[PDB]
Subunit: 238 residues, 4 copies
């Protein structure tokens, strides 16, 4: 399969977990991949492994909450490549705190900061590059963007906000030929609130979120925009 | 590129339009295809064109509202092939009638009968075959399953019913390894094929809101169906995927 | 409180359960109530109890799946009263069957027949009366109109269909001044578990009065800018 | 009608517009009302008009983006009253910017800051008082929390975030007897003047803008025992917009 053949793909949070798996899967589908993470060492380790397999890949440190660093990366991509075919906003954090605890404030600030504000930073900064290539954006949402589930308030809200960001980015960028979608994973390999309701009675394998991301990023989804696709084993239908 | 390699796919309403395109697209992805349509001659003409191109396909008449005929087809499939890998419930009709008109009743009965009751008939009858193969089901939902849009009451309700049917079939069939999903298209080009049936202004409800400002190509609805029916969707069930140019997000 | 002062309210399935409670609550809010049920003896018993309490009520047998009987009632209402201020489609049934069982077909036909086809029959037939009064409609949906929960396929589908019916009725009847809404209850005190209780935020079954109050609200001028809407009354179930 | 009889109700952004009208409508339903607004003179002016009509009300200046100011108010309410029966998070702002413009950043920050971060600030600070009274919360969401409509990105996102906040606050505060809900207005007469209207009007089935009192009534309903089995819920008050 070559669903992303010769496409330039940027994946944030690519040092481990789903982001690294999405980076590897995009390369397997023919993409050249830019892997970025707050842990630059991890991003470069993942990129060097792809390179060692004959893929075209590079890795860099990037804190998505640093608007100056995001702008620098955006200028760099535009200057070296002239555009960006796919942006995957995968960088995220979570936390543990009930709403009625003082701990909820610091957890809220941290999670909102990365999951929502960082996704806005990278999304807004990469618009010129996405315009030049008529690329598309895939956000990492969550089933927590539709129900509260068992995640902390900052996480639920950040993912509900990403759901809305998908819609309004799609609206504003559609005139420029840019599609914007999201996946909403349930629990993926990377607990009661999810297992009671997941129809498949199993957590997802990382490859099973990779394939829907690649689909949405590909011409198979060329009439799909503003859409959040559950990848959740039936969780939200239960 | 063979997402459905050697898989047996049954498509209803496959004699024309989107159903025929889903059938061809499945074959191009490696599937053996059973095409059925109320017009059996049309289903056979579509199947024969696939056979001439080297694919493996067959066509039959099927009235999805006839439970006896649906059961006969299911028994035939189980007996001849031992199972069914993909069911696509595409057969469907629409209509024009406002809720306050007497005409709304005949339209409602007809549309509910084909779109919802037919989809239930075919889905329920093929469960044994789907269990044997651990196959999956893709329903044809609609943007009208989420909002009223411009469609007649029977159509809106049939597609909202299909959305719920997706969820409860997914729940009850998950222990048998059967995924159940749906696509929710806006207007695609096959629905514009007959000119005299395109009333002036008739697509404004959709065109005024769709973000891409165009009717979808028929192949752009085929590809998401194939995706949902494939192992790329192996962790997706109970899910209804809009394929609508951004209509429902607007 | 007189949220439905002098309004005429028709409640289907009012012989017992939520329909009888909605009928009583509507009368308490000032309404004249027509109570109908396939069990006409129960409908008349509920109506006569309301009459004995000093309210204005009447009861009749009605099978909502019988289009001829539904039309006769709609004609009687238009002739005797000139219009209808509120229609509450509450009549409903349920059943038990998994989708892969042969029994699912009989359950499907029975449940679709009352819950969806019956609601269509009554809704469509009462449009002339609703237009004359600029009345409104409240359907009984369910949390099962949004997720599969633990209900049988025919029930789940019937309630998702009611959700859509709410939307397209609202669209077509808005130009005539008719609002159309629905409540989506969780599990209520009635003929009626873990699938719900593990998820309900309030960790209890709803009281019947707690579905009556939202129905009265939607039927009242408090909801004069609300149409096409389905209001969960579910202790938080759908938000969990 | 006394749906909120003797209940203490705090309304943010109550200096004008919907917040002022919710404050007045709550007082009409028997509530004692605390009105707060970044313009404290306006909040006190609205409170004094209610006091003149025989209701019990007070006004204060409050910037909902100032966490120390919010904490002081929460302390004052808890100390003086021992609890809070209703919190209405109404304070909000909007703005004009498309996502691909540089102006979208400053609009985003400003709108997120009031609409989402302020609603969080007030909601989290008032939890002790809400616990002591088993009060409830009504957020001001929007049809924009469900579809993109015509609003700027920061507004759409802030209201979808409010939608999710309703759900997770309801989950965490249900053990303490606190319901949390929201209304989702469409276009209402007020700052329908810095958006212009046709994105809402094309889809609004009633083909009219909602009157202010038609949003007040559903807010009062959700804040009252009529909604005692309703939590985590976002109620559209939109003329049919989201059903179209
Ligand atoms: N794993 C799941 O079950 C699941 C479910 C739903 C959604 N998601 C979403 O998938 C995405 C990835 O999840 P994961 O399980 O791989 O998480 P993970 O914590 O394993 O990986 C997150 C990655 O993002 C990076 N990161 C954190 N903060 C950053 C910042 N400021 N700038 C740049 N990079 C940063 C981390 O270094 C890490 O490499 C997240 O957005 C998460 O919310 C995951
Ligand atoms: N009780 C709950 O937990 C709950 C939850 C969600 C939704 N609902 C819905 O609320 C409505 C009332 O439920 P309930 O619990 O009071 O049920 P119930 O069975 O106690 O009452 C239903 C009433 O409808 C009548 N009825 C049945 N078939 C009829 C027909 N063909 N014509 C006329 N009347 C008929 C019955 O005789 C009965 O009086 C139903 O639509 C139900 O689906 C109930
Ligand atoms: N989305 C929609 O369709 C829609 C339409 C109208 C109103 N609304 C919502 O209703 C609410 C009220 O709207 P409105 O039309 O009355 O707005 P408005 O501009 O008329 O009034 C808003 C009030 O909030 C106050 N305020 C602003 N920033 C503040 C801060 N940092 N701290 C405290 N107070 C502050 C202002 O002083 C003002 O009095 C808002 O949340 C708004 O988003 C939504």
């Amino acid at each position: 399969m070559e669903l992303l053949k010769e496409k330039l793909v940027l994946v944030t949070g690519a040092g481990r977990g789903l982001g690294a798996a999405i980076s590897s899967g995009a390369a397997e589908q023919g993409a050249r991949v830019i892997l970025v993470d707050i842990d630059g060492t991890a991003a470069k380790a993942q990129a060097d492994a792809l390179t060692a397999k004959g893929f075209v890949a590079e890795g860099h440190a990037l804190d998505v909450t640093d608007r100056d660093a995001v702008a620098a990366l955006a200028d760099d991509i535009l200057s070296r490549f002239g555009g960006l075919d796919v942006l995957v906003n995968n960088a995220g954090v979570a936390g543990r705190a009930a709403f009625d605890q003082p701990e909820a404030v610091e957890v809220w600030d941290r999670v909102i900061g990365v999951n929502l504000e960082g996704a806005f930073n990278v999304s807004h900064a990469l618009v010129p590059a996405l315009k030049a290539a008529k690329g598309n954006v895939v956000h990492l949402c969550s089933v927590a963007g539709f129900v509260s589930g068992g995640s902390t308030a900052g996480y639920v809200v950040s993912k509900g906000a990403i759901r809305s960001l998908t819609q309004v980015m799609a609206r504003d960028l559609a005139p420029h030929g840019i599609r914007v979608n999201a996946v909403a994973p349930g629990i993926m390999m990377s607990t009661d609130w999810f297992m009671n309701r997941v129809m498949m009675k199993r957590i997802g394998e990382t490859s099973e979120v990779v394939d829907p991301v690649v689909f949405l990023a590909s011409p198979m989804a060329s009439y799909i925009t503003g859409t959040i696709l559950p990848v959740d084993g039936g969780f939200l239908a239960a």
